[PDB]
């Protein structure tokens, strides 16, 4: 074949990690049920003329998992640290949690900052629910500022329910991680 490299993604609690895996891998969106962490699917892939399999690692953070997640860290290629444009407090936490964590077992492995559930930017329930205790989603301008700030490779946007912008956060997964 060609290239194997593991890609591991994390963030806050129901910011739609999983589903994007999903998405990505089985190639439609699970509304029945999600699991906690969707097992270890290893995908094939074609960016810039590479021959990929992308191996994707579920974690969480409540509770089980907690523990568990440092353990699938080791050898990764890429990482996709996750938020929710509708929960800016996830945005808050890339910062304060997962960069430094990240940074702490996975250092020099390349960053993609990635923000989901952008369908939800300008659904009026969640403009509603999010002015009430004072906020916004998140702007696709803070999130582009957020990358830089930690140091990411790139910043991409993606829904996961819509299938829009999905492929290119793992293109642009695969690209960083086959920079070497
Ligand atoms: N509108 C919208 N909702 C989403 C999207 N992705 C996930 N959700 C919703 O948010 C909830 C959390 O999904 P989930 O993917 O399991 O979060 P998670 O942080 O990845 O949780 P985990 O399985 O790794 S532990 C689900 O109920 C789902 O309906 C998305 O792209 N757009
Ligand atoms: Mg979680």
Redesign the pocket.
Known sequence: AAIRKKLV?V?????????????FSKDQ???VY?????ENYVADIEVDGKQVELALW?????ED?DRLRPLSYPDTDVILM?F?I?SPDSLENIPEKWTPEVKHFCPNVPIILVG?????RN?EHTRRELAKMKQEPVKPEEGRDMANRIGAFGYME?????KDGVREVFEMATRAALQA
């Open positions: 993604i963030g806050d609690g129901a910011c739609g990690k999983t589903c994007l895996l999903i998405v969106f699970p509304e999600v699991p906690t962490v969707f579920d974690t969480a953070g409540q998992y996750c929710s509708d989901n559930k952008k369908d939800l659904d993606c829904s996961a329910k819509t």
